[PDB]
Amino acid sequence: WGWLVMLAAMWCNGSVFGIQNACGVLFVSMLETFGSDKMVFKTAWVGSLSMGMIFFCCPIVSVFTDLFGCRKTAVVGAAVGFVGLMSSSFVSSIEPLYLTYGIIFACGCSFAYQPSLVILGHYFKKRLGLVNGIVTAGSSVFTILLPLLLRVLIDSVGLFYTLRVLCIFMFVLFLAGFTYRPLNFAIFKVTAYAVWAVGIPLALFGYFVPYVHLMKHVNERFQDEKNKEVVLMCIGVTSGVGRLLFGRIADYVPGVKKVYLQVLSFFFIGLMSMMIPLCSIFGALIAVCLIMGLFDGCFISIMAPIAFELVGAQDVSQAIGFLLGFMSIPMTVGPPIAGLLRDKLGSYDVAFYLAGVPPLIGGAVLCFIPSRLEEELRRRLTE
Ligand SMILES: N[C@@H](Cc1cc(I)c(Oc2cc(I)c(O)c(I)c2)c(I)c1)C(=O)O
């Protein structure tokens, strides 16, 4: 088995999130097929539910995996994902899609992906973090490359065939799953965690809007767009390097003392989102995309260490579970509201601005977290 555990974990992490991020390239043609009324409002749910259900289901998997074992639940996740992707075929209306794609597919994907971490632990009972960086660099490949394959694949055979063929990834995941073989509400009393856990979800209330609506905002330059997929590929091409660099950066002395760089990340990503609906020359959009992706990777990379910095090591699991439970909502509610925001009398021009407000509030809230304080001074002032 050996290193193949990490090798297959790479494939799993790529397979799930590459699709979840290429969702837009599906959406652009899914809207066209079996098209209308008020379609843009309904369709967004197809990807919104898919992205929300993974986070909603991740915490509960911590009971299933511990109940059945590490080897299981990965086979089951892969099989359920394959069943859902296949069932997405033979659908003559958009209504069943919410159930075939989304609910079923993500309820499979979360089961497939969650146990990967528990077995990356014990990879070699050492050298954690470096393995995670390797896996991130690997999944960067699938995030970068998949949009190119799907874009050319769609025109040859329609959406139905595309989803019926994407089952190859789930099948390979199912086969690789055989490698795995091993060989609570009291948290809120901590004020720092209480503030942070509300700050982050309030910050991400527009994070997933671009990943869904950017490919449809494109075609504003209907003629000059000799190539579209690059504009979405260059988000991941920068996210990979950003995560890789910030993994190294996090622990270095000049900035490891107490990290609040997530405030900077939110500020920059919000500003760049506020920049999209204005730039006209093509290259400016790619520059904005790179600026977005770099900090998008940085913020996600820096998250986990803050978890055990704020709270003891024992409660990190519960902390992450609650955090993902809260995070389930904003990504489900974002894209639909963003689409509808001016689906009457306008375009995304008026919708991308308001997608940029929540990040600033989130950054302020996170910057409003106390520290460097202890109660030994309580004798002096308030008593
Ligand atoms: N849109 C992103 C997808 C993505 C979102 C989040 I939020 C995230 O952060 C975590 C951290 C831990 I730790 C988890 O167990 C989980 I599940 C998600 C990661 I990694 C990836 C992209 O472009 O790839």
Curated annotation (Swiss-Prot):
Membrane spanning stretches: 1-19, 44-64, 74-94, 101-121, 130-150, 158-178, 192-212, 230-250, 252-272, 297-317, 320-340, 352-370
Membrane topology listed for this record: Multi-pass membrane protein
Tissue expr: Strongly expressed in kidney and skeletal muscle and at lower level in placenta and heart.
Catalytic activity of the protein: 3,3',5-triiodo-L-thyronine(out) = 3,3',5-triiodo-L-thyronine(in); L-thyroxine(out) = L-thyroxine(in); L-tryptophan(in) = L-tryptophan(out); L-tyrosine(in) = L-tyrosine(out)
GO terms of biological process kind: amino acid transport; aromatic amino acid transport; thyroid hormone generation; thyroid hormone transport; thyroid-stimulating hormone secretion
UniProt keyword list: Cell membrane, Membrane, Phosphoprotein, Transmembrane, Transmembrane helix, Transport
Topological domains, Extracellular: 20-43, 95-100, 151-157, 213-229, 273-296, 341-351
Cytoplasmic side: 65-73, 122-129, 251, 318-319
GO terms for MF: amino acid transmembrane transporter activity; aromatic amino acid transmembrane transporter activity; L-phenylalanine transmembrane transporter activity; L-tryptophan transmembrane transporter activity; L-tyrosine transmembrane transporter activity; thyroid hormone transmembrane transporter activity; transmembrane transporter activity
Record flagged with keyword Membrane: yes
Keyword Transcription found: no
Gene Ontology CC: basolateral plasma membrane; cell junction; intracellular membrane-bounded organelle; plasma membrane
Post-translational note: Not N-glycosylated.
Subcellular localization, as worded in the UniProt entry: Cell membrane; Basolateral cell membrane
Biological role stated in the UniProt entry: Sodium- and proton-independent thyroid hormones and aromatic acids transporter. Mediates both uptake and efflux of 3,5,3'-triiodothyronine (T3) and 3,5,3',5'-tetraiodothyronine (T4) with high affinity, suggesting a role in the homeostasis of thyroid hormone levels. Plays an important role in homeostasis of aromatic amino acids.
The family this protein is said to belong to: Belongs to the major facilitator superfamily. Monocarboxylate porter (TC 2.A.1.13) family.
The protein, known as: Monocarboxylate transporter 10
Species the sequence originates in: Homo sapiens
Gene designation: SLC16A10
Parent-record interval covered: 69 to 470 of 515
